[PDB]
Amino acid sequence: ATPSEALAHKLVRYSVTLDADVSATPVAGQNYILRLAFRQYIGLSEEDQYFKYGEVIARSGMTASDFYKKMAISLAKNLENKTESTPLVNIYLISAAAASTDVPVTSATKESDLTATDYNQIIIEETEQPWVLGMMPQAFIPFTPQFLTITVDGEDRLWGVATVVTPTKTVPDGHLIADLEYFCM
Amino acid sequence: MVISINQVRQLYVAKALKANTAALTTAGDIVPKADTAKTTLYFQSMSPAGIVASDKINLKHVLYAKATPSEALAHKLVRYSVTLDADVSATPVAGQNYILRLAFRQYIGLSEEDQYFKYGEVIARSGMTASDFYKKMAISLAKNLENKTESTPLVNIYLISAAAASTDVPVTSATKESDLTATDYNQIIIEETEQPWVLGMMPQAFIPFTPQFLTITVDGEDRLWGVATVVTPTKTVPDGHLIADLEYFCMGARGDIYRGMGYPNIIKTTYLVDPGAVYDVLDIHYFYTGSNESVQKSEKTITLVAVDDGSHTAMNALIGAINTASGLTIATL
Amino acid sequence: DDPVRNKILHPMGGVAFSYRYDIWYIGTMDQPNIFKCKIKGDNEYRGYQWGIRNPFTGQKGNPYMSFDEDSAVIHRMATLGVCVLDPTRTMSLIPAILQG
Amino acid sequence: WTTFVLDNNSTRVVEKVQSRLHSNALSAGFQFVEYKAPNGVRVRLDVDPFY
Amino acid sequence: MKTLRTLKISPNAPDINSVWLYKGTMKYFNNGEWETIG
Amino acid sequence: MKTLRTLKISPNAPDINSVWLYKGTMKYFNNGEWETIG
């Protein structure tokens, strides 16, 4: 009785921006660190937690789009390097001219590849994990992008806002019905 | 409730002023009976088990006879208005945490030494309006209060918009900031609440409070951020629950005093007061003196309760029937 | 800080008698400036006015009856006093809401 | 508390340790685990691994 | 006559006995209010 | 929340925990750069 879109898991997206109450432009001498709190890394509990980081120290005359450009390549160099045993999370950049097409950032992508200077947000989308037909079930690693405190005036405030948006990408029905017909035999 | 007595108190419920005896057929009827020479006065009233006559009032020995308008026995629920005063700041200061402490007294026990404190806190922002502060302070009060799964909260928090100025928006723990859509909220109303009541066992009581503010620092000095002013009360607690507790106590000066002690083996006392109707009261205080050595007085009182229609027609008919038969002049209310 | 007796609250929290600063002894005095006064003879009295029986004592039956009501009344009396010799030797600061 | 200055002879937020790298080798760190309010109020911590 | 031995960078008013430095201002406590220089 | 305690008169910029005074321009370290008060 299921219309086959209900059995398709929705990949969660977080749009992280600079906090407009703190500053819409990057403070110069501070460390902007984004902490990704993964919750089911290798085991199947919420007590098996893994933490990846992206650190961008700013400099003078660094606009918001150059900061979103450099944070995404700082995230992608940590999250999708050669020393990653599983696909962990997907980094994306949306420029304000398109506002619906997300520019993919990977570890091979460097700063000369990204040139549009109207980047509005960094989208961090969760990945698909490996799947064997009967040995690896379709499980996902959930996460929450977290922020550290920057010293804006003299006080320490979180530099970002992690907004959950509508999930655009859905992993289809195929890997579960194939895994169900393995079990129901 | 336990009340004091001047050696006795008798209570008779007036439901219909019959003109004479043998017209008393239903329970609650009463006739004021007296002789032609106006020496003795009594009331023949139809109890739920038959006609019963009161103790005879010697009309040379009446200390006072006065009646109560039933508006003077209703308790007013106190309202407090919480506002940001213009002397400190009429707008919320951007860095200050605004804490409003409600200081209750006569909480669960019976003394002012039993104090209870509930809180409401708002830290203001740069672009916070004074109207948006009253929306957040009322909700922050409605989370610390109105959290009782058991019963009604100790106070009710309301919001008045300046465009309305007489209709109060109710703020509950369910209420979020999306539900309050006005942009001109100017005060917070912290009203009293009627406590639970059960007949004869839990008397009618109230929990007085005081909205108290903590110091914020604006011009370098720690100033109290608000002013709590007592608005005139707009809500009343009617005369039903006090008269039903009054009949309960004063029907043990005539009937059974074991009102449910050995529980299957009891005498049931049928009461005529319903607790959901207002009642005018009429007290007649008399005494008894004996002859030649027993000159001591045995002071007594007889209480008559009559239902109120607002225009006091049942008590004024009962007073006017007494003044004809007894010759006293009780003031009609 | 007794909240039953004082009954007037401060805006800064608490009860307003708690903000009252009393220096009860300015300097050393040879004798007590403030003391209670008592009479050397026993001057607290007790009395019983009653009918047939006395529940205050437990005496069933009365040789000398006060009345015929069959009740019991207790009567007590006392005399007392306080002397403050010098009131210029106690300094007080009271909040202005307590004057009236 | 602009009234009082907080030195290192009392709080010891930087503390001298023994290392091979230097003679005057220093540590750094502190934490506040208690507050003492006026009129006898003291609040201490109990860090439960259940919360 | 009045020594202000500290200066504090904060969006909130620090204290009577310190100097309040906010973005391009240097306020201090004088005559019961905050007086900005410049 | 950042307590600056010393003011320094120098023709070039001192440490970021001190106030920079030169010839009539008070500069302090806010938002990662030296902010002139005036």
Short mmCIF file of C-alpha atoms in Angstrom, two decimals, chain B:
data_model
loop_
_atom_site.label_atom_id
_atom_site.label_comp_id
_atom_site.label_asym_id
_atom_site.label_seq_id
_atom_site.Cartn_x
_atom_site.Cartn_y
_atom_site.Cartn_z
CA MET B 1 -15.40 25.41 57.98
CA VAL B 2 -15.05 25.84 61.72
CA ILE B 3 -16.40 29.24 62.73
CA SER B 4 -16.71 30.77 66.16
CA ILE B 5 -20.04 30.81 67.99
CA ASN B 6 -21.57 33.14 70.54
CA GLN B 7 -22.61 29.96 72.41
CA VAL B 8 -24.73 28.71 69.46
CA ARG B 9 -25.48 29.45 65.82
CA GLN B 10 -28.61 28.13 64.12
CA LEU B 11 -29.07 28.27 60.35
CA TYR B 12 -32.28 27.84 58.37
CA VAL B 13 -32.43 27.91 54.57
CA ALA B 14 -35.16 30.03 53.00
CA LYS B 15 -36.32 28.75 49.62
CA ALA B 16 -39.92 29.99 49.53
CA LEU B 17 -41.60 32.44 51.89
CA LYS B 18 -44.89 30.74 52.65
CA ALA B 19 -47.48 32.89 54.38
CA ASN B 20 -48.49 30.53 57.20
CA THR B 21 -48.18 26.99 58.46
CA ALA B 22 -49.90 24.15 56.51
CA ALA B 23 -48.55 25.89 53.38
CA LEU B 24 -45.08 24.47 54.10
CA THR B 25 -44.99 21.39 51.86
CA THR B 26 -41.57 21.35 50.15
CA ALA B 27 -38.21 21.35 51.89
CA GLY B 28 -36.72 24.81 52.30
CA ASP B 29 -39.96 26.70 52.94
CA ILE B 30 -40.15 29.08 55.89
CA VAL B 31 -42.75 31.23 57.64
CA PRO B 32 -41.81 33.83 60.29
CA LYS B 33 -44.26 33.25 63.14
CA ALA B 34 -45.10 35.56 66.03
CA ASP B 35 -48.00 36.30 68.35
CA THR B 36 -50.40 39.24 68.21
CA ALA B 37 -48.73 41.00 71.15
CA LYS B 38 -45.30 40.67 69.42
CA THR B 39 -43.58 39.14 72.46
CA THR B 40 -42.04 35.99 70.94
CA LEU B 41 -40.68 35.30 67.46
CA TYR B 42 -39.77 32.01 65.80
CA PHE B 43 -39.58 30.45 62.35
CA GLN B 44 -41.49 27.34 61.34
CA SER B 45 -39.48 25.86 58.48
CA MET B 46 -39.97 22.69 56.44
CA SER B 47 -36.88 20.56 57.02
CA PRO B 48 -36.25 17.63 54.63
CA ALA B 49 -37.92 15.34 57.22
CA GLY B 50 -40.79 17.54 58.45
CA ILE B 51 -41.86 20.88 59.94
CA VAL B 52 -39.32 22.25 62.43
CA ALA B 53 -39.70 25.41 64.52
CA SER B 54 -36.72 27.47 65.67
CA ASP B 55 -35.90 28.59 69.20
CA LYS B 56 -38.30 31.30 70.33
CA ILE B 57 -36.81 34.80 70.18
CA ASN B 58 -37.87 36.98 73.09
CA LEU B 59 -38.38 40.28 71.27
CA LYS B 60 -37.50 42.29 74.38
CA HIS B 61 -34.07 40.62 74.19
CA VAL B 62 -32.82 41.18 70.62
CA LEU B 63 -29.31 42.63 70.55
CA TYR B 64 -29.11 43.12 66.78
CA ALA B 65 -30.90 42.08 63.62
CA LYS B 66 -29.12 42.90 60.37
CA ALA B 67 -28.90 41.46 56.87
CA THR B 68 -26.05 41.11 54.36
CA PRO B 69 -26.44 42.15 50.69
CA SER B 70 -24.45 39.11 49.32
CA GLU B 71 -22.18 41.44 47.37
CA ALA B 72 -20.14 42.05 50.53
CA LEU B 73 -19.34 38.33 50.92
CA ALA B 74 -17.81 37.87 47.45
CA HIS B 75 -14.02 37.90 47.31
CA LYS B 76 -12.28 39.96 44.63
CA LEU B 77 -9.42 38.36 42.71
CA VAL B 78 -6.46 40.74 42.90
CA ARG B 79 -4.93 41.97 39.62
CA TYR B 80 -1.39 43.34 39.33
CA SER B 81 -0.12 45.33 36.34
CA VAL B 82 3.53 44.80 35.38
CA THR B 83 5.03 47.58 33.26
CA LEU B 84 8.45 48.92 32.38
CA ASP B 85 8.56 52.31 34.08
CA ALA B 86 9.64 55.38 32.14
CA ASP B 87 11.95 56.49 34.98
CA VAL B 88 14.46 53.66 34.52
CA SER B 89 13.82 52.89 30.83
CA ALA B 90 10.61 52.58 28.81
CA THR B 91 12.47 50.30 26.36
CA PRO B 92 14.36 47.09 27.22
CA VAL B 93 18.09 47.65 27.70
CA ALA B 94 20.07 45.57 25.23
CA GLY B 95 22.34 43.62 27.57
CA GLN B 96 20.30 43.23 30.74
CA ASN B 97 18.64 40.05 31.99
CA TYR B 98 15.16 41.00 33.22
CA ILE B 99 13.94 38.71 36.01
CA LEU B 100 10.48 39.02 37.59
CA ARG B 101 10.03 37.14 40.87
CA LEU B 102 6.55 36.30 42.16
CA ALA B 103 6.63 36.14 45.96
CA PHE B 104 3.75 34.03 47.24
CA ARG B 105 2.69 33.61 50.86
CA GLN B 106 0.18 31.37 52.63
CA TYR B 107 1.36 28.62 50.28
CA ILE B 108 0.42 25.11 51.29
CA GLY B 109 0.46 25.82 55.04
CA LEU B 110 -1.52 28.43 56.90
CA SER B 111 1.06 31.12 57.71
CA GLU B 112 2.92 33.96 56.03
CA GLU B 113 6.10 32.06 56.98
CA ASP B 114 5.26 29.62 54.15
CA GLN B 115 6.61 31.46 51.11
CA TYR B 116 6.86 30.26 47.52
CA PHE B 117 8.76 31.92 44.69
CA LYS B 118 8.15 31.41 40.97
CA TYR B 119 10.16 33.24 38.34
CA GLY B 120 10.12 34.63 34.83
CA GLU B 121 13.25 35.71 32.97
CA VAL B 122 13.87 37.54 29.68
CA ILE B 123 17.28 38.66 28.44
CA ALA B 124 16.65 41.52 26.06
CA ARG B 125 18.25 42.16 22.68
CA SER B 126 19.28 45.18 20.63
CA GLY B 127 16.12 45.56 18.56
CA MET B 128 13.61 44.32 21.14
CA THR B 129 10.48 46.44 21.36
CA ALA B 130 8.83 47.13 24.74
CA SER B 131 5.76 45.37 23.31
CA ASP B 132 7.81 42.29 22.38
CA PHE B 133 9.26 42.22 25.90
CA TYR B 134 5.80 41.87 27.46
CA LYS B 135 5.02 39.02 25.07
CA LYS B 136 8.19 37.19 26.13
CA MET B 137 7.95 37.97 29.86
CA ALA B 138 4.36 36.71 29.99
CA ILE B 139 5.33 33.48 28.21
CA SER B 140 8.40 32.99 30.44
CA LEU B 141 6.03 33.35 33.40
CA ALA B 142 3.58 30.95 31.75
CA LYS B 143 6.27 28.25 31.52
CA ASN B 144 7.31 28.40 35.18
CA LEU B 145 3.71 28.89 36.24
CA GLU B 146 0.98 26.94 34.34
CA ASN B 147 3.25 23.84 34.38
CA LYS B 148 1.03 21.96 36.83
CA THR B 149 -0.31 18.73 35.39
CA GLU B 150 -2.40 18.39 38.56
CA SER B 151 -4.37 21.61 39.00
CA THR B 152 -4.89 25.22 37.97
CA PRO B 153 -1.85 27.51 38.48
CA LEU B 154 -1.37 29.82 41.43
CA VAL B 155 -1.83 32.89 39.20
CA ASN B 156 -3.22 33.58 35.74
CA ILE B 157 -1.04 35.67 33.42
CA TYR B 158 -2.83 37.92 30.93
CA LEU B 159 -1.76 40.40 28.26
CA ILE B 160 -3.56 43.61 27.31
CA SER B 161 -2.96 45.15 23.90
CA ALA B 162 -3.11 48.94 23.75
CA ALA B 163 -5.64 48.86 20.90
CA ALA B 164 -7.99 46.70 22.97
CA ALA B 165 -7.17 48.07 26.48
CA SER B 166 -10.00 46.15 28.18
CA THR B 167 -9.86 42.58 26.79
CA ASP B 168 -7.04 40.43 28.16
CA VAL B 169 -5.19 37.87 26.04
CA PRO B 170 -4.68 34.68 28.08
CA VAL B 171 -1.12 33.34 28.21
CA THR B 172 -0.89 29.60 28.93
CA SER B 173 1.99 27.10 28.77
CA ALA B 174 0.54 26.03 25.41
CA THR B 175 0.74 29.62 24.10
CA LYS B 176 3.72 30.35 21.86
CA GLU B 177 4.85 33.69 20.44
CA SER B 178 3.20 32.92 17.09
CA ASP B 179 -0.21 32.99 18.78
CA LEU B 180 0.32 36.51 20.20
CA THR B 181 0.21 38.60 17.02
CA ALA B 182 -0.28 42.12 18.38
CA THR B 183 2.43 44.78 18.24
CA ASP B 184 1.26 47.06 21.08
CA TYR B 185 1.22 44.98 24.26
CA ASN B 186 1.64 47.48 27.08
CA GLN B 187 1.20 45.59 30.38
CA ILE B 188 1.07 42.15 32.00
CA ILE B 189 -1.79 41.15 34.31
CA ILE B 190 -0.97 38.71 37.12
CA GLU B 191 -4.36 37.76 38.58
CA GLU B 192 -5.27 35.64 41.59
CA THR B 193 -6.75 32.16 41.19
CA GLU B 194 -9.62 30.43 42.98
CA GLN B 195 -8.25 27.48 44.95
CA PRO B 196 -10.02 24.09 45.11
CA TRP B 197 -12.87 23.61 47.56
CA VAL B 198 -14.58 20.52 48.94
CA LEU B 199 -17.58 20.74 51.24
CA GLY B 200 -16.82 20.90 54.95
CA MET B 201 -13.22 19.68 54.66
CA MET B 202 -11.26 22.22 52.60
CA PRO B 203 -12.20 25.83 53.42
CA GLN B 204 -12.06 28.61 50.86
CA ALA B 205 -8.58 30.15 50.87
CA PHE B 206 -6.37 32.26 48.63
CA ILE B 207 -2.65 32.66 47.98
CA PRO B 208 -1.57 36.32 48.10
CA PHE B 209 1.49 37.32 46.12
CA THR B 210 3.60 40.31 45.05
CA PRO B 211 5.34 40.74 41.67
CA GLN B 212 8.91 41.68 42.56
CA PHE B 213 11.69 42.75 40.22
CA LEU B 214 15.44 42.24 40.28
CA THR B 215 17.93 45.01 39.65
CA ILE B 216 19.19 45.84 36.18
CA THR B 217 21.95 48.39 35.61
CA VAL B 218 21.16 51.09 33.06
CA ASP B 219 22.89 54.39 33.83
CA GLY B 220 25.63 52.74 35.87
CA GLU B 221 23.26 52.22 38.82
CA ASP B 222 21.30 49.08 39.68
CA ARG B 223 17.65 50.04 39.19
CA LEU B 224 14.47 48.01 39.60
CA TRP B 225 13.27 47.52 36.06
CA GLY B 226 9.50 47.67 36.59
CA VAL B 227 6.52 48.79 38.67
CA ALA B 228 3.82 46.47 40.05
CA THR B 229 0.52 48.35 40.41
CA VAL B 230 -2.65 46.74 41.77
CA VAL B 231 -5.43 47.21 39.23
CA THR B 232 -8.99 47.25 40.56
CA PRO B 233 -10.37 43.69 40.44
CA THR B 234 -12.63 42.60 37.58
CA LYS B 235 -13.30 39.01 38.70
CA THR B 236 -15.15 37.81 41.80
CA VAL B 237 -15.59 34.57 43.72
CA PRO B 238 -19.34 34.23 44.47
CA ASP B 239 -21.10 33.57 47.78
CA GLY B 240 -21.88 29.91 47.04
CA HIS B 241 -18.99 28.08 48.70
CA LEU B 242 -19.05 30.08 51.94
CA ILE B 243 -22.76 29.58 52.67
CA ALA B 244 -22.54 25.84 51.95
CA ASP B 245 -19.65 25.68 54.42
CA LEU B 246 -21.76 27.82 56.77
CA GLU B 247 -24.75 25.47 56.63
CA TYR B 248 -22.42 22.49 57.12
CA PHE B 249 -21.11 23.79 60.45
CA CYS B 250 -24.42 25.21 61.73
CA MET B 251 -26.42 22.03 61.04
CA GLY B 252 -24.46 20.32 63.81
CA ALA B 253 -25.96 22.66 66.37
CA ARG B 254 -29.31 21.10 65.42
CA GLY B 255 -28.50 17.70 63.93
CA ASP B 256 -25.64 15.21 63.81
CA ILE B 257 -22.10 16.20 64.80
CA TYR B 258 -20.53 12.98 63.44
CA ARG B 259 -20.52 14.01 59.78
CA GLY B 260 -18.99 10.89 58.31
CA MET B 261 -16.63 9.50 60.95
CA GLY B 262 -17.48 5.82 61.10
CA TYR B 263 -18.24 5.90 57.41
CA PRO B 264 -20.88 3.18 56.74
CA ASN B 265 -22.48 3.82 60.15
CA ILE B 266 -23.46 7.48 59.75
CA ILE B 267 -26.45 9.80 59.83
CA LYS B 268 -26.80 11.70 56.56
CA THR B 269 -27.71 15.38 56.85
CA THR B 270 -29.57 16.70 53.82
CA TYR B 271 -28.36 20.23 53.08
CA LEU B 272 -30.52 22.74 51.24
CA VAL B 273 -27.77 25.14 50.09
CA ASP B 274 -26.38 24.44 46.72
CA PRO B 275 -22.81 25.77 46.41
CA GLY B 276 -23.42 27.18 42.92
CA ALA B 277 -25.84 29.95 43.90
CA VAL B 278 -25.41 33.27 45.70
CA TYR B 279 -27.09 33.87 49.05
CA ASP B 280 -28.23 36.84 51.09
CA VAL B 281 -27.77 36.36 54.83
CA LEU B 282 -29.86 37.64 57.77
CA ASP B 283 -28.49 37.40 61.32
CA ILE B 284 -30.71 37.82 64.40
CA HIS B 285 -28.83 37.87 67.71
CA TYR B 286 -30.89 37.34 70.87
CA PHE B 287 -30.45 36.05 74.41
CA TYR B 288 -32.26 34.43 77.33
CA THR B 289 -32.50 35.63 80.93
CA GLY B 290 -34.03 33.75 83.86
CA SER B 291 -35.67 34.88 87.06
CA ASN B 292 -34.58 35.81 90.60
CA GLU B 293 -31.04 34.45 90.59
CA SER B 294 -30.27 33.35 87.02
CA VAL B 295 -29.73 36.81 85.58
CA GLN B 296 -26.98 35.54 83.27
CA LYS B 297 -27.61 35.82 79.54
CA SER B 298 -27.50 32.89 77.13
CA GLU B 299 -26.78 34.69 73.88
CA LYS B 300 -27.90 32.99 70.68
CA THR B 301 -28.07 33.71 66.97
CA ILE B 302 -30.35 32.56 64.16
CA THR B 303 -29.09 32.74 60.58
CA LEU B 304 -31.38 32.83 57.53
CA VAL B 305 -30.06 32.38 54.00
CA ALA B 306 -32.02 33.24 50.87
CA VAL B 307 -31.04 32.90 47.22
CA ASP B 308 -30.14 36.08 45.31
CA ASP B 309 -31.57 37.09 41.94
CA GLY B 310 -29.42 40.24 41.86
CA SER B 311 -32.29 42.55 42.84
CA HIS B 312 -32.51 40.97 46.35
CA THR B 313 -36.19 40.05 46.05
CA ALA B 314 -36.10 36.89 48.19
CA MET B 315 -34.41 38.43 51.23
CA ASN B 316 -36.44 41.66 51.05
CA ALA B 317 -39.64 39.61 51.05
CA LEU B 318 -38.31 37.65 54.04
CA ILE B 319 -37.32 40.82 55.91
CA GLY B 320 -40.69 42.47 55.20
CA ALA B 321 -42.56 39.42 56.48
CA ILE B 322 -40.53 39.50 59.70
CA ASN B 323 -41.07 43.24 60.25
CA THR B 324 -44.83 42.77 59.93
CA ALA B 325 -44.99 39.84 62.36
CA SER B 326 -42.19 40.72 64.79
CA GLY B 327 -42.38 44.51 64.85
CA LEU B 328 -38.63 44.96 64.49
CA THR B 329 -37.34 47.25 61.74
CA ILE B 330 -34.62 45.38 59.87
CA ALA B 331 -33.14 47.52 57.11
CA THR B 332 -34.04 46.20 53.67
CA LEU B 333 -31.01 45.88 51.41
#
